[PDB]
Amino acid sequence: MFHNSYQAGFLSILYSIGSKPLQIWDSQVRNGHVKRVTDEDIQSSVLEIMGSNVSTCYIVCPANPKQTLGIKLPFLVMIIKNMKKYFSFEVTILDDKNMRRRFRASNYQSTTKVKPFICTMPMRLDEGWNQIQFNLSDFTRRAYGTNYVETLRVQVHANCRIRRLYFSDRLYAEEELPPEFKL
Amino acid sequence: TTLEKQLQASTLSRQCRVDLLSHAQELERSSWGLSKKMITLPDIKLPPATTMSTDNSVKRSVNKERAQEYTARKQEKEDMISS
Amino acid sequence: TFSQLEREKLRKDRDVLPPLSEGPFGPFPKNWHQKERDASKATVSTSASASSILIGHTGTGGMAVSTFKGTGCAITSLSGGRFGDPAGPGKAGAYSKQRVPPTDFRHHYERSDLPLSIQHSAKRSLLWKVEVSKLDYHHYLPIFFDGLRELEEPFSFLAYQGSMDLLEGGGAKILPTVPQLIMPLKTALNSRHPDVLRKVFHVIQKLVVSGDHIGEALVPYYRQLLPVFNLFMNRLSSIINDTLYLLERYGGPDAYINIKYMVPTYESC
Amino acid sequence: REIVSCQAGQCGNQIGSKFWEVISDEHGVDPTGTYQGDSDLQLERINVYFDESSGGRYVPRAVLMDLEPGTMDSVRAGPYGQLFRPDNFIFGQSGAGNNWAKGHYTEGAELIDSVLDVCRKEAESCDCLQGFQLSHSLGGGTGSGMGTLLISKLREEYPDRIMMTFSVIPSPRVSDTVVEPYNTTLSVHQLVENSDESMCIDNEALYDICFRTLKLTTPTFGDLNHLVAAVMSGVTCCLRFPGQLNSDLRKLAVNLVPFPRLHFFMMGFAPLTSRGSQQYRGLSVAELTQQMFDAKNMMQAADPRHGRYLTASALFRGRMSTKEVDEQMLNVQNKNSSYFIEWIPNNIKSSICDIPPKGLKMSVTFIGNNTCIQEMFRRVGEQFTGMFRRKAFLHWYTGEGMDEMEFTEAESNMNDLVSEYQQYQDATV
Amino acid sequence: REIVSCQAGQCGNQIGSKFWEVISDEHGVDPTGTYQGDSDLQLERINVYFDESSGGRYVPRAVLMDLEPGTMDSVRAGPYGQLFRPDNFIFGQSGAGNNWAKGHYTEGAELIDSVLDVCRKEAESCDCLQGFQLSHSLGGGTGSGMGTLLISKLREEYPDRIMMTFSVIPSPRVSDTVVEPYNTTLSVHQLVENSDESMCIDNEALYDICFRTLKLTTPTFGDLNHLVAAVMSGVTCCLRFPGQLNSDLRKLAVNLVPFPRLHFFMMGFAPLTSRGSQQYRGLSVAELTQQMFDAKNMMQAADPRHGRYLTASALFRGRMSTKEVDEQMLNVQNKNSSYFIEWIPNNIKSSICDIPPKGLKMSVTFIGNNTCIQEMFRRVGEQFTGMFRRKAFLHWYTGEGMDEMEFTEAESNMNDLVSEYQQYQDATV
Amino acid sequence: RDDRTIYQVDYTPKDRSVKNMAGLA
Ligand SMILES: Nc1nc2c(ncn2[C@@H]2O[C@H](COP(=O)(O)OP(=O)(O)O)[C@@H](O)[C@H]2O)c(=O)[nH]1
């Protein structure tokens, strides 16, 4: 959707402060729930997604499957809270040879593996709030030997607590981050 | 079952259902217009013993709603015949 | 009118709640008091004595057609493949509220034995005639825990805030009383009521955090308290999850297994 | 293609027992349930009336009913008693007491549940059944009451399938009780809109069949029941055996029911020869048709002079040519067309089956829908008016939960049926 | 895969003894221990239940246990009583007095040491033991009181082995003691915690099957005992004989136990018919399915129509194909889907064994984990609370060293089990 | 009373030897 829009510096795809934060997100919910709660750690309202099955219930951007994102920014930064439970996220990107390559990171994964469409990784999350940084271009080069063009879709599964998802062009420092991107 | 309920539960088209219904109602209208033998009724000045009874018979006695339903169905029946 | 809303909620819950107190003081005497001078009676005997039809005129006579299905086939069980009616068995009622038997904290409260009183402010507080840390915990704490099943004022607030105070203060006097705090918590949890459940959840978090080895002593008694947690964490979910997190955190190594054995849909903290 | 049968009352049970004896003889089934027939045609369609068990025994598709267990014991102790399934013997402790009310509302209801359980079990056990048969007497208590209740419940449950009932309407000259009017009326006004087709039986006609056609010495109820059994076998023969001109119960229903309420049929059999005159007469299609249309050959006692055939149906069995079995139907339709109606032309349905009843090279069963069948209804209605006008014997029926309105409605329906039969009795040209 | 069996109490002793009778009959074992079977398959897997001696005698792998000495003499007086090993006959000088306390704490404990000794002696002889089977009644004193302690210590010693128990649940309208609720409440939580799978027997249901399913005039304990032995032997049909779809005790437990608490099962057997209708009934696997899922055919007295099915298990026996052993389960599933839990698709485990029970061409055993098992304990808890409110009949238990807190905890445990069944009855996807 | 397994009844030593040598000739 962002093909014709400005893509430089920062581009937030999800933010727990907007009036209706899920405008561009499809809350595919099954035996779970997506809701805005008040976190005691930060005294602020954040997205809060629960589900017995991590795969069935999730939120995916864009909502329309035919529609797709157009973000060129190679870095994806996610401020998510480790709920001490199974968590996963999915990022579909378009490579230079025009394949949709699908990078997944989960905490229940054992070891990383690469398959002709997917690249699954395990994650280790510290207790409390976490700032996961995902370098799409570097990991695409590492796992596929292929240039990164732009990301098509982001789908973070259930069973987690989410503050803000934003793409950045370079590895911004904590001090260099804007005040609204802080925690 | 009554015919109306039977066709309500059956698998005809609506036009076919109303056609069979109309056939039956017209047959019954012709039957009504046909001549009969009068439905006989109990006589006047009937013996009292025909009505008043004994304690044995009241021991072997095992309805208002049933009679009301009968009368309502009859009344709608002659209303349809008149119409 | 928030007072009206609370009143209406208690009116709806009356049929399942324990019988309400007959006033601020106690049950009224039956057929009590006497008239000032009354009006005498003299009534004479006469005035005292005065004080499936089947209509053969409609039906399917000679019209056996292939397009007819029977009526009552879907009601007549045992026909074929049906060992029961299509309506199905009724609701189990596990989710529905269950009758709450009367509390002993009630009777101990109409008896002038509780050493706590009410002080009025923005939120009412508790004034204790005797300092908390020198109470007979083995005698008093189970009473307050059993009082959690009360909802009508003031008994509900008395029990709730008394439990909170007796867990905030007391220290090592709470651990020996753990085995006898399970039955009142069991009766409170079986009430199947969201308000009682929330109060019990807050009480259990306070109990777990108040002292040392409290979680260790509660671990062997997970057989009793967890069924309601499992029942209501899927239909309150957040507070149940918080209670489970605290229980696992302060329960030691056996807490994980003892929560897995009762709540299949649980994860480590 | 199969029919499951029920017997109600003592009369119905005896008639059904004789019918099952006849069917077992035709299909080569001895009382122990085995098969000793000497033809493949007996086994090719034995599933119409019999169900094979694990051991190969052929259990009849029969449901027996009577509040009196005496007839249950008698039928199970009879020569063919072991044939029937033990669980199909459904009976009560106290009899119907010759009371339609007792057999339809008080005692019949408490047993009709298990009766329907058994019938439903049999119907679903077998594959795809043509319909239900019932045998009973309208002058009885449980044959009329429970029989009509069974018919009503089976119309509730299986309206898809055909319904055929053999009702033995009593006659004043054979009347062995006093409540024939009440029972017969309370049963017929049920069967008018409940039974799909109801052919009539009269013991008065059964007696003089044994005289004007058989000239036999001692006629008994068992002797009478064989006529009903033979006509049942001729009616359902074509489903069990091949034929040049095939037919089944739905075919007869379509060809004999011009209007839904006109489904009461007058029935007969041929040949009916005596032992003395057996060799004297030369049996042929002409004689068979003449005996079919002979007034005295009918096994229902209503005079066919006073009525006109709405429709007729001849079900021939044996080895005969087709043009002379249709030409004799043409012959009667021409010779005595005054029996017939003009608005329905060519009133005769015909069927040919290659297998005749045992002991016949040619045979035929005749089922006629005539405007004369209302004679029995008129006589029973006259007796009913005589009894009901003075409220005689009505306390028995009113003490079993029934009201006078049921009798009033029964009389109204009987009068309507009589009138709609009498519509076409006039000999218009 | 050797199952080792134990029978506790008088009820347990008789049930196990005749169960060994049935096992010997189906394996061709002479009551004197010799083998007379006509099939090699009987001896192929006879080591599951029997141990061969030096002389070829097949001794049952059973432990007979009860505090009363007379029951050992009665069992030996039984026709197959000479089959058991004499040292397995272990008994106390004084009986339990129908007291759970006496059977569990004072008199049972002093002899449970020898019980465990003989149990371990028999367990060590098996190369790969499958598990421990127990047969007892929860209404008795020594069958329940000491049987539960036996189950607990066998759980302690052998955790992985499959623990099956047959608990004859007492009930009010056939009650013959005043402390059935006491014993049952004191035994239920041990059965819950220490048994892999505890399946229930109710005398009203066994007796009802005898009256109406078997239509035999005077049922005895022998008859109910035969009924339960049928399924008792049938549950290990795949263990003892080959089949198209083999199974075993742990596979059944896995397919029937979704959660550790939910392991209480109903009972089921088919075919069951009267002697007079043995040859009339057409034995088929479809009829087997219909009867097995029929509520009355259950030999536990709690209507399955009042609850929902967690899982079901159908162990069919006899030569059969797969059409109506899977499509019939599918048909009952999608026709009574209102009676089956949605979040467990295809609740029915189906297993096939080729060898049919002796005297039957085809049979089936049913294991149902319905939610209606909570109706087991509704009435038991009501009666227990009725007795416990006024503290009656409790001095007998408290004089043997038991505390009132254990009774209160037993109440709490039964209530927890009932609520656990209720929540999965009304649980939604 | 047949105790043969389904393996035995369906799985039988199958002989392809000619029963009728007249057709072969
Ligand atoms: N044809 C024939 N008629 C019978 C037989 N038994 C009784 N009937 C007639 O049935 C009438 C009595 O009916 P009943 O047996 O009492 O009917 P139920 O009460 O329903 O059993 C008598 O008038 C007899 O003429 C029989 O075996 N054959």
Ligand SMILES: Nc1nc2c(ncn2[C@@H]2O[C@H](COP(=O)(O)OP(=O)(O)O)[C@@H](O)[C@H]2O)c(=O)[nH]1
């Ligand atoms: N099915 C069946 N039940 C029995 C038998 N013997 C006793 N019972 C039941 O067991 C209960 C009494 O058990 P009891 O003999 O006191 O057990 P014990 O105390 O361990 O010896 C009664 O309610 C009976 O219904 C039997 O042979 N078969």
Ligand SMILES: [Mg+2]
């Ligand atoms: Mg296997």
